[model samples]
Target chain A: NITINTPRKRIYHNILETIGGTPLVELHGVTDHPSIKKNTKILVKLECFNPMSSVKDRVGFNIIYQAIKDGRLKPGMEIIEATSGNTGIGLCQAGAVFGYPVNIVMPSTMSVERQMIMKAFGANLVLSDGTKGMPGAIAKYEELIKQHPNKYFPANQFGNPDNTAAHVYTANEIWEDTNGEVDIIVSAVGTAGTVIGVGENLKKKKKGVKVVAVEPAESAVLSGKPKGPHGIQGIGAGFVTDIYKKEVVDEITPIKTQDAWKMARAVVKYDGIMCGMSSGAAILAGLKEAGKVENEGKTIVIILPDCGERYLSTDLYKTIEEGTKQQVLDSLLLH
Target chain B: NITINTPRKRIYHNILETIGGTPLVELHGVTDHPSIKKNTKILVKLECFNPMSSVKDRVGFNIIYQAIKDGRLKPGMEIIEATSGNTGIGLCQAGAVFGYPVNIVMPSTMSVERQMIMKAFGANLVLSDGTKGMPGAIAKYEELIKQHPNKYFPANQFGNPDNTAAHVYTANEIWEDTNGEVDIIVSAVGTAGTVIGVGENLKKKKKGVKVVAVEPAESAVLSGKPKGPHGIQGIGAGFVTDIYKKEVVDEITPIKTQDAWKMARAVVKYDGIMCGMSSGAAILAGLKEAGKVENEGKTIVIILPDCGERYLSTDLYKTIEEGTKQQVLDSLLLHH
Candidate 1:
């Protein structure tokens, strides 16, 4: 329970040095928008400020470091994993620094910048058919790992305990940083590792603290609905992660891809904090939870995974005349 | 002379903060290759470690910062510049932080990544005719500046004394860091700011210090020859820069594009330092000078201007079995 003083230096020596201790900023301008009637105090956790420019760096580095410390990663051991995009970059940076050959299996639909960065860090890339989605990449990675010798170590983030531990550490840090003042915490469930692990830690700290899980409304995987193709990157649990504890979550909010991306654009245009769709979804969920409660000074925190620079090619910044903008706005304000 | 402790932290708050103090690493692996002579001890000034991942960040930040301080940059005035690549990113980063609207005029042949990065920082990018080269882009930028009424501030790096002052600061920092121990300094002369400015500072510190200027031999503008097209980016004298002081230069080494690109590739493969073509030329020049010198313990420093990742799409990284490689190798060794 260490209280950090104000006016702290933002720059750190390494990306690892910036894993936790994120600031929770109140979303002041948008709470009174005509679409919402609830007077909710919304606070967004700026996790994009983390090292390697994403929240996944925490999970990626922790998993790899734990693997090495536990004697699982010996010399000449090849590390392989399937990722959405920036996670591959994080893993590649860690792999390069630590003498291990890393193989990243990612969808071909990923941006060229992501692919080039992975290659630049000396990682072997295996591009999967993107039309089939991340599962196609995951399936190919499994096949490759099985075919390879025992020298290959696969850090399957979906099922790994370290993935959950990363969020647990993050949740504990946030809890201490805010001085147990958090009433509700909103997070998008990708592998459900972040939501469940952080939720478990928050609940353990304060029994009344509500943990809200966000998902893609069109493609509801954790809500037990049939999975559909969701254009959003870095969220929407395709399958139930082993670390997902349903009891920890008080509510689940399904935000559409358009709404999530719209809010992400707003975050950039307004706050200068560039974030992805999942963060946008989490922001919507945070606002929703904040509106429902009548308690004064109720602190709500939303986790933003990464910066918006990666989404420049996507519809995050598209003009409102486009039909997608209406749907995005509708997702943010449900009737 | 100040004595500094070794093994200090290298990271800085911003790219501009990391402009001048670059580490000099011994180019150990490639120097002993059969094609390269064993007598030369190649050393490289690692500038890719700069905040914006290029040495231009220093010049870009220094130019803007100085302008604002000197009242040359009026409040709400727009900044304009013409660049082939990295300098635009540097200027954009500075502009974003300083509340300036930066207009970059570049050749359309530039990569999508460079354009995207510049745009990401909210810079207005105007594409010039690529067939016309940098001089064409410069002319368009000049025209835009002339047509506009008090709307544009051109940090004309080619003719700006501030460009020379930035490199002079860089060279003085290196001298102070090395405790006046530098015997020779090798740098690629694009606007010729680095060689002339750093050369002047090094001469002030140690009169015996040799300052070697490197350029692409195929496009030898300093050699009083008509400039030709070369694949090397960010270092060549297409026209004489006002910043280029020929009196300060001890010698000019014209490097071939092929050999420079080859060394660029070798840098990535050997040291994991992905540097641009001018850095390759500077390294090759350092090796050549190191070989010719009689002093065994002489320390030679070579400036690597930018990163190679920006030039991955160019012919710099393509297979060197092409005729350009042999021609570049011949040019580097023939004069020595």
Candidate 2:
């Protein structure tokens, strides 16, 4: 009988198969730019369609699955990771599916909604200091592994080879979705897994495909600038990881937090697309690349790492006006 | 020349095409009831996979599209609707896509996230008094339409024919996905569009297919009980809508709010499925149906209306423990 096992028709045997096949939707509302050519099309690969609503679902699932296949992660062992938010939710979902207890070490500065979601998926949260940042969370994760040897398998998202390999699979999906005609591929460089893996993979398929990496302007370390704090949560991890290769990405486009946040708001308000700040950052960078003279008439596909639901508590929607009962009534009363 | 219009792959021209085609996943974790036959399968249709993360997206999109098709919704007209949250988000998205401004009248008591999301989609929110409940919101909506005649298209979700027609389309998807083998279908009764429409369509295809509707145990209006307020959002609107036809559904299963909420929490913890409270209610009802001996070895498909992300601010995950830094560090030191 036709059942959940069939992958051709959106039926899934489990949650894992449902991770990568996200919608590649066109952007119409916010594409008004002087530099953009008439034939140039900007499309977004929305990763929020992943089971946990983030692109990290691809890498997180890859990390845990690969670790298991290699016998590094034993049965009943707890899965531990240091993350801002998205990867933790991804790992928590992976851990739930595989019957592993997940213990996430995240900076306390992340949204309360993120912690609640991870906890809902049966993850144990170990809140690290916000001032010390993600590095502090990584330190806590390392300490947990040392304190309890062989009990917890640290996913090691930063340096894991599987992280890059996962996005190779994501790139393959993008290639298939776009019929291999994609010219410029854009993504926010987080663990550098998405950019490096997607860049390397897409370039191998097509000779002239340009890969662009977006980073928070405040933390422009990829452009050989000093690391600084930034509001864009998922990308610009403040430090480069082992997986990032300089040659893979063609250009680095640094975006200010306000510009990224406004685009995130603009897409939702104008395009009806609910995306997070890093998604906004990628879209902004993608549009800039579209505006370039050389990239005219080229197809630029950007990766939206996650949805806007997670960033509701943040300043992502801070500028939107909240209407009161009287105000609503007044609008109704108005002609 | 493969472009955004291609539907065979996951490429889309716009957000409207992404309204449906949610994943139908098998539930393995919480199916431990002794009453359940070993061969029976309980699969969930995750409607949260919709663009706005709710099943109401299907109906909301349908309502607006059908209205526009029938020439009731003119160009540049403001669309107004009274909703709790999900429909408001859907209509707002539709409004954004079709170049129509949207105004949503919702109760003041709905979560802040809901308001933020609707406004983020560029819909103007008009908060109604919570004490008067949805009626107050609807009253406000009616007043808005009366104040500005012909300028607003009031999408009557409760009474609209398109609501049922939308779920008929949803039923056709489930039927195709399940190979016309879905023996029992379960859904939470909100506007009754899902239950009535899905039940009627599936039953037409398969003679013995059972249609089950889940309502709040507190407010069992479909079962002819006195209506009371319940914690389950999106369903149990305290009054039955015009689209609800009693003959379509074979059974009405009333579920407790606590059971639904706990199941919602359990599915995430066990199955890695993130769904809201009414989805939990539907699953609870579907599991109960699967337990019946006559329904043994049957494939029961349940509709999970939305995801768990929206209910974070609500009491949906109130029982989840928030750990402290010291406590987490202490756990590491203990097991070795």
Candidate 3:
């Protein structure tokens, strides 16, 4: 009965076992630039393949597990966190598995689907003021912790070292998947855990392995630009976190919201890689990295932060609307 | 730099390479029936893990590939199919890879997310009359094909043996994953390919491996009743198919729409297994099979046809909405 298959593709005893070890697939449609050499490969470390459909699954599970082991968190303690969407989803799923009650404070500006997903996982969602943004969400999270005190274990993802520690495994997976042939890694800066953790690990492994951080052009704080409004939901949280390592990051690539979304739609339609806008931004940066003449014969890896399913209500998929009845009928008849 | 991982979890040359070999996970929350012995295992062959997020991806790719191999389909020929949702999605992705333009005729009553997903993969969607249902959709599909002869290759999923052949591999994966310990295979009847193909394969391998088919309670056609409307989107197309081998199925279990959807919501919230209504029906059937005294200690496998993500717009996810502002604020403040 044994057919051709891989070892990890086997049965999992629980859903938590399905986290991480995401697929690394080659970019075909987006790598069609003349400046890019033939030997150059643009691959995506699709983090959306995680059980919770985001790279944050690693961070979510690791933070909770480590905190419990170290006595920072205990059983029967409520877990609280301020997150955008994906991290909340991860935390909720992890919380479900660990039998911890999860409380998430997210900005009202975040997508409704994210709120619904967290709620679906039995999270008590508290939406902060939309105008105050992520800062307001953090304020609410802090307020909850202050009111409850010892009753809650605050999953401070921003400043948590466990966040960075999570991506070390991510980087190792990339190295193993690529056979240590990776020349550059591109990741969008949210908590900066991904770039720093992944960069530090890969840089120590091979010489001249460059790490690039992608941020929205509107909120290009990493590129020394003032933070502004951007449509990309998960990344560009408007401020740098304590986990960011400047020395590990070799370059910063700022992508416009439109450009990132355009690439997101293109990849979804053309290459069947359905990822959120932040992943699109990272993909765009990886393409730019591949275009450089110095990067010839180099393998560039980009992190796809989350799946496109969560972003269905967003502009990523909303731009394509069902045609009018007459228009659809006419088009079908003509075709 | 190498870390612990499986070989198949490595680099893929194309998205299609990531299609099959979906995880076969053990069911926990739904297998809590007292009649089920401790050795009785309820396993779910999660087909949602397919690249296009459906079991039909296997059928879609197999049909197109086989059609082209036998000269039934050409390079520039457009592909057409009548589907509920998941098969259309699979066809769209397969069409994107093979450079074939895909045309889908679906009922307008289906969830909008499926339509958007198919369109995202560049499929031309033609919504049939919702009142007429799948038959109308099929009528529209036939009309399109007849309008342009020799220019289209109809992906007739209902009658296609390739549909059956696709699930033979699914059966093989289940057998390999379970190590020949599978006693019962439960599948909701759609094209009947999954039940027939999977059953035929497993029965051949080990004797007394019973195959059970699930159908909508309202539309118990396989149980010698008139087909009625059901809310489960993927299965129970209201009629038996040409590819269905009646002898291959040992029993048929009928599940209510509310019951199937309730299990779907429960799995998503409890076990973190988010699958569609039909998968929930199959899970219920598997649970029933596990609960039998004769089947005690028997390993049962069920197919989760597609992801819950596609059914987000439906009652599956829609049942749980954002709490009211006053309710949310009160709940948070009270927790303090």
Which structure among the candidates has the greatest TM-score?
Answer: 2
Per-residue alpha-carbon lDDT of model 3 for B36-71, expressed as tens digits? 678988888888777667888888888887888889
How far does residue B148 in candidate 2 sit from its true spot (Å)? 1.8
Give candidate 2 regions above 4 Å deviation: A1-10, A107-111, A128-136, A320-335, B1-10, B129-135, B320-336
Candidate 2 residue-wise lDDT, A218-238, digit = tens? 999999899998999898888
Report, for every candidate in turn, its global Cα lDDT versus the true structure. 0.69, 0.81, 0.80
Which candidate achieves the best lDDT against the true structure? 2
Q: Interface RMSD, all models, one decimal each?
A: 10.9, 6.7, 3.9
Stretches of candidate 1 above 4 Å error? A1-69, A93-99, A106-122, A126-136, A160-228, A235-237, A240-335, B1-53, B107-113, B127-136, B164-187, B192-213, B222-226, B247-254, B273-336
Error of 1 at B54 (Å): 3.7
Sort all candidates by lDDT, best to worst.
2, 3, 1
TM-score of chain B of each: 0.86, 0.90, 0.89
Question: B182-301 in candidate 2: lDDT tens per residue?
Answer: 899999998899998888888888988888989999999999998997888889978777989888888999988877887787778778999999998998788778777799989899
* DockQ rank order: 3, 2, 1
